[PDB]
Structure formats: structure tokens, C-alpha cells
Amino acid sequence: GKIIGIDLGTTNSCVAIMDGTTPRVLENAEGDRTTPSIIAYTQDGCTLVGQPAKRQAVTNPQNTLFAIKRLIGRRFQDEEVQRDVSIMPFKIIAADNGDAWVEVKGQKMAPPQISAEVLKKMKKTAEDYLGEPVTEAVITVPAYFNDAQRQATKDAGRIAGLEVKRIINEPTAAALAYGLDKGTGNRTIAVYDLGGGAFDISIIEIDEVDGEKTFEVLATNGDTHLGGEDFDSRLINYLVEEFKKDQGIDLRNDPLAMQRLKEAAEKAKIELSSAQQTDVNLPYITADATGPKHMNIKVTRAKLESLVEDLVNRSIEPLKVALQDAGLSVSDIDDVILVGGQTRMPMVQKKVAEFFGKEPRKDVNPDEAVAIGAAVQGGVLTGDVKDVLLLDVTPLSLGIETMGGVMTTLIAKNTTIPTKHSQVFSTAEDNQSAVTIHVLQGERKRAADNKSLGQFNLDGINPAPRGMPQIEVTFDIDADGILHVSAKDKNSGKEQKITIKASSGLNEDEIQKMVRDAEANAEADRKCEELVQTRNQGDHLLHSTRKQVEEAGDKLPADDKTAIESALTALETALKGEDKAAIEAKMQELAQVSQKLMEIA
Numbered sequence: 190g191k192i193i194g195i196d197l198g199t200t201n202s203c204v205a206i207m208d209g210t211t212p213r214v215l216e217n218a219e220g221d222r223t224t225p226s227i228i229a230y231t232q233d234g235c236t237l238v239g240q241p242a243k244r245q246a247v248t249n250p251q252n253t254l255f256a257i258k259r260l261i262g263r264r265f266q267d268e269e270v271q272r273d274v275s276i277m278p279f280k281i282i283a284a285d286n287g288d289a290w291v292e293v294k295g296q297k298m299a300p301p302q303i304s305a306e307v308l309k310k311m312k313k314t315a316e317d318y319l320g321e322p323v324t325e326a327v328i329t330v331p332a333y334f335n336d337a338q339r340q341a342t343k344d345a346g347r348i349a350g351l352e353v354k355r356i357i358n359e360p361t362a363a364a365l366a367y368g369l370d371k372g373t374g375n376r377t378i379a380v381y382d383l384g385g386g387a388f389d390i391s392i393i394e395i396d397e398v399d400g401e402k403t404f405e406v407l408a409t410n411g412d413t414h415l416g417g418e419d420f421d422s423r424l425i426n427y428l429v430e431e432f433k434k435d436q437g438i439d440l441r442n443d444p445l446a447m448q449r450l451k452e453a454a455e456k457a458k459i460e461l462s463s464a465q466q467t468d469v470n471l472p473y474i475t476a477d478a479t480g481p482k483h484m485n486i487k488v489t490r491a492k493l494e495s496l497v498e499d500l501v502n503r504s505i506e507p508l509k510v511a512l513q514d515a516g517l518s519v520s521d522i523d524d525v526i527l528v529g530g531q532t533r534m535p536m537v538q539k540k541v542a543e544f545f546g547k548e549p550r551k552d553v554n555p556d557e558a559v560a561i562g563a564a565v566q567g568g569v570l571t572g573d574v575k576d577v578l579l580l581d582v583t584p585l586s587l588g589i590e591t592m593g594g595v596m597t598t599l600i601a602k603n604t605t606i607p608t609k610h611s612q613v614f615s616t617a618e619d620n621q622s623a624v625t626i627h628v629l630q631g632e633r634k635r636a637a638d639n640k641s642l643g644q645f646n647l648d649g650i651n652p653a654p655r656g657m658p659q660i661e662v663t664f665d666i667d668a669d670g671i672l673h674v675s676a677k678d679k680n681s682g683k684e685q686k687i688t689i690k691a692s693s694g695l696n697e698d699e700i701q702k703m704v705r706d707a708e709a710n711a712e713a714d715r716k717c718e719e720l721v722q723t724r725n726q727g728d729h730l731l732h733s734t735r736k737q738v739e740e741a742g743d744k745l746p747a748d749d750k751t752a753i754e755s756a757l758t759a760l761e762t763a764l765k766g767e768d769k770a771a772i773e774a775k776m777q778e779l780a781q782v783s784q785k786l787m788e789i790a
């Protein structure tokens with residue numbers, strides 16, 4: 190059917206469709222144009238995504254997962270993951286291959302599955318709105334996502350039952366959303382996307398020659414682990430230090446208190462984007478030997494700015510790096526476009542404006558432009574948006590490890606994608622059977638300081654002295670920015686088989702198994718919905734039977750009254766439980782014992 194565009198954000202996700210030439214953002218089941226990227230697994234087998242998961246996060250700290258986008262595609266021993274391990278209320282564990290997974294109720298779960306739950310909620314929103322199945326989608330990633338993160342997001346899309354037609358960089362989607370109506374003036378733009386967990390900057394030229402829009406990404410940079418979560422962490426650290434000073438209690442040891450404190454810190458941070466001062470005001474935070482406790486702390490805007498200024502400057506540096514890569518200057522920027530809720534902070538806007546010497550645009554919605562651009566990209570793929578060309582780039586230099594552990598670059602950063610690079614490898618010693626190519630991404634001169642894409646073993650090499658075979662290895666980077674390594678015999682042209690070791694991601698068996706698990710999870714969700722409907726029916730029956738008993742009054746026989754009231758109590762007790770069959774049996778018994786009373790009514 191239609192290709193929906195899904196913004197899979199760290200904090201909030203957003204689904205859009207291409208209604209003709211007009212992109213439209215679809216409200217979810219709860220009536221919100223954005224959905225929190227929160228996933229909760231209850232004890233009863235039900236899965237909550239969005240606001241329903243958000244509401245119960247306090248009572249389910251170890252089984253409510255959020256900010257999974259900051260774990261997806263990452264190794265367990267990574268510094269960012271290691272820091273996040275002691276912060277997140279849910280358990281972060283190491284997969285068998287060393288990837289960072291989560292543990293929920295004793296179950297190891299890859300971040301692609303958890304993100305696929307959010308993608309499934311977006312899919313269900315699109316299908317409820319359109320009244321037809323959806324099987325194709327465009328999914329967004331941060332522009333600076335590496336190969337592992339992009340492939341992991343694509344795998345998450347596949348596990349959700351979606352054919353991922355395109356993985357598009359979020360600043361590119363913002364530029365697509367901006368360029369649909371407005372100029373069309375051969376502009377040059379700087380997209381500054383600061384979300385909940387990731388930050389990107391993209392310098393993109395949009396020139397329209399003879400009604401043919403061309404979006405060419407001149408440069409891109411950023412930090413995939415810098416976002417609103419870090420601002421919240423700074424505010425939480427200040428709050429806990431002040432509360433420990435003025436109350437003598439370390440609040441980090443109480444999971445419920447930490448959950449409510451994180452929520453209040455985010456609330457106060459959002460409030461300080463409009464107010465000059467606010468109050469972190471939470472009663473019943475924790476308890477000590479004396480009894481209940483309360484928190485009321487004044488926070489000015491200046492204090493938050495002091496706490497987050499260094500993060501803002503960390504976001505400023507990639508602007509300079511990207512401008513240098515694009516070979517331009519600050520004055521060359523025709524427009525500056527802010528994307529992301531965290532750019533709503535006055536300090537962020539002031540810093541960006543004073544860096545660029547220019548006011549950022551104010552007609553770009555920072556919460557929905559990315560999904561709209563994804564929908565526009567989908568329409569371009571289908572053909573419903575004609576005369577649009579896209580020349581995106583890869584954000585990281587692709588290289589191989591050579592003698593001394595030194596990186597040799599084959600595809601430099603900011604190279605336009607899709608792209609190819611072929612290189613011939615050969616033997617270096619007598620009677621070799623396999624040659625290993627250590628493929629990595631990064632800019633540092635040392636291989637150990639970069640991101641390892643893995644060891645590609647060309648094994649099964651015919652016996653020969655050193656230097657005899659000529660094996661042409663081709664490195665492809667597709668429109669999604671994902672690497673594909675192929676091999677061929679230079680002399681004959683026959684393909685050479687490659688084995689990938691010491692890599693990251695999911696194999697085909699895991700992906701298919703997780704698709705089956707997602708289908709079973711959908712079955713369980715349907716059963717949970719049916720149980721809720723049954724409980725609603727039971728409540729209706731209770732109310733109707735009580736009304737009829739009350740309106741019959743003294744006309745009702747005493748034995749029938751006692752039996753009906755006992756049945757009412759039993760049905761109420763069953764309704765408070767979590768057993769559908771018991772509820773249905775109690776409803777049947779109540780209907781049987783009160784049949785004549787309801788027939789009279």
C-alpha cells in the first residue's frame with residue numbers, strides 16, 4: 190500500500206503519510222500527533238507503548254524501557270553504554286556477541302525488538318487511520334548513525350513487519366519537509382537537529398533548475414549520544430545534590446523516587462523554556478525513619494542554562510567541523526533550521542543564532558518535520574512526488590586496518606551515496622588459505638580508536654606462493670548508508686565467499702525468530718484487549734443488575750436477593766482479578782441467578 194514515513198525518535202515517534210502532494214501527520218489511538226517511545230511489559234503478558242506505558246512507569250521501573258535508540262547498534266562495553274548501565278532503571282546486559290541488550294523479566298531482548306514495538310504502534314496508527322494494511326515504510330535515523338546502528342534500525346523495521354523502503358537521515362528529512370513549499374530559491378541551509386538523545390548538523394544545498402528540485406547534502410556531522418536526556422541528567426544531578434545537602438538522604442537509591450524525579454526534571458526543564466523560574470515540587474518522594482517527605486526547590490532559567498551550557502557548546506563544535514568539511518563559511522548559510530524539541534530552549538536558539546550571525550527560521554515545526562520529510566521521501570520512491578533528486582552522503586570515513594594497526598581510507602566521510610569502491614587484495618605469504626580484511630568506520634588514524642564493522646575472511650584460497658591470487662573486493666554503500674562487501678576473482682570473475690566475524694548485529698535466524706516473537710506478542714496484545722473488553726462488559730452487567738435489584742426493592746424475594754448479591758460480590762472479585770474465564774463464568778452465574786428480575790425489567 191502507501192509508504193508511511195516513521196520518525197523513530199529517542200523520546201517521541203511520529204508517523205506521517207503522503208495524501209497526494211500534501212503530507213499529513215496521523216494522530217495515534219490516544220489522539221496525539223506524537224507518541225512516546227516507551228515500552229512497558231506487564232506481569233500479565235501485555236505490552237504497552239506510548240502514553241499507557243508512560244503512565245505506569247513509576248510502578249514498573251525495571252520493565253519500562255525508554256531511550257532504546259541510545260542502545261541500539263551499540264556494544265555492551267562501549268563507554269556510553271557503560272555509563273547508561275548505572276543510570277537506566279532497566280537492566281542492560283551483554284549479548285552473546287557483545288552487543289548491548291536489555292533484560293526484562295529474565296528475557297534477553299535486542300533493542301531492535303523493543304524499537305519494533307514502537308514501530309508496530311506507528312504501523313497500527315497508520316492502519317487504523319487508512320483502514321487498510323500497511324507493509325512498506327520509510328524509517329529515519331540520525332545523520333551520524335554508523336553502519337551498525339542503521340542496520341539495527343532497519344532490522345527493527347523488519348521485525349515490526351515493515352518493508353523498509355528507505356533509511357533516511359533525519360536532517361535530510363527535515364530539508365525535504367522544508368523544501369516542499371518554500372524556496373525553491375537555490376538556498377543553502379544548515380539543519381540543526383537536537384532531539385532527546387541525538388544531535389546532527391547538516392549543510393545542504395537545495396537548488397531547483399527547470400522545476401527539478403535537487404537536495405544535495407554538502408556536509409554532515411554530529412553526536413549520536415548528545416540530547417535532552419543529558420540535560421535531564423544534569424538537572425537531576427543538581428536536584429539530588431541539593432536534596433542530599435538540605436535533607437541528608439541520597440535519593441538515587443530509590444527507583445520510584447528516581448522515576449518521579451526524572452519526570453519532574455524534564456517537566457521543569459520544559460517549563461523553563463517559557464518561564465523565568467519554576468519549582469520542582471514533588472510530595473511523597475521517599476521516606477526515612479521519620480516518615481513521609483516532600484520536595485520544593487526553586488529553579489531559575491539561569492541555573493538550567495549554567496547546567497547545560499557545556500552541552501550546548503559540545504553541540505556547537507560539530508557546526509564548525511561540518512562547515513569546514515563543506516568548504517563554506519558562516520556567511521554562506523542562506524537559512525538555519527532548528528529541529529527537535531530540545532531546540533525550543535532559549536539558550537540553544539541564542540547560541541545557534543550568535544554562532545551563525547542569523548536568526549533561525551520560525552516556520553518549521555521541530556516535532557513533526559522529520560516524519561513529514563520521511564513521507565515525502567516515500568512519495569518520491571512511489572513516484573507521487575516527481576522531479577526531485579536526492580544526493581545524500583555517508584557521515585563516517587570507511588577504511589581497512591593495515592600494517593601497524595593503521596586505518597587506510599577507501600571511502601572518505603561526506604562521500605555522496607550510493608557509492609562504490611573496488612580494491613584488489615592478494616596473498617602475502619606462501620600457502621595461504623584465507624585473507625582477512627578488518628573493515629572499520631571512523632576518522633582517527635588508529636584502528637582501535639574507530640568503530641569496527643568487522644573481520645571479512647576471504648577463506649578457501651587455492652594453494653599458491655605469495656602474491657598469486659587477485660581478489661577484487663568491492664565496498665558498496667547504498668542509499669540507506671549501509672555497507673555491502675562483495676568479492677570476485679579478478680582473473681576469472683567467479684565470486685569469492687566471505688565470512689564475517691567479530692561484528693555487530695543480528696543474523697538472519699535471529700531476525701526471523703524475532704519476527705515470529707513479534708507476531709506472538711501481537712496475539713498476546715489482542716488477548717489483553719479482549720480481556721479489557723470482557724471486564725468492561727462485566728462492569729456493565731454489575732451496574733445493570735444492581736440497578737434492577739435497587740428498583741425492585743421490597744418486591745424481591747429474600748433468598749433471591751441474597752443469591753443475587755452474593756453473585757454480584759463474586760463477579761466484582763473476579764473483575765478485580767486478571768482471569769478472563771473466571772470473569773465470564775461469574776457473569777454467567779449472575780445472569781442465571783438474576784434471570785427473572787432482569788426479564789421483569
Ligand SMILES: Nc1ncnc2c1ncn2[C@@H]1O[C@H](COP(=O)(O)OP(=O)(O)OP(=O)(O)O)[C@@H](O)[C@H]1O
Binds near residue numbers: 198384388530556
Ligand atoms: N519546550 C521545550 N523546551 C525544552 N526542551 C524541550 C522542549 N520540548 C521538548 N524538549 C526536549 O526535547 C527532547 C524531545 O525532542 P524530540 O521529540 O524531537 O526528540 P527525539 O526525536 O525523540 O530525539 P532524537 O531525534 O534525538 O532521536 C526531550 O529531551 C524533551 O525533554
Ligand SMILES: [Mg+2]
Binds near residue numbers: 198199359384529559
Ligand atoms: Mg528527532
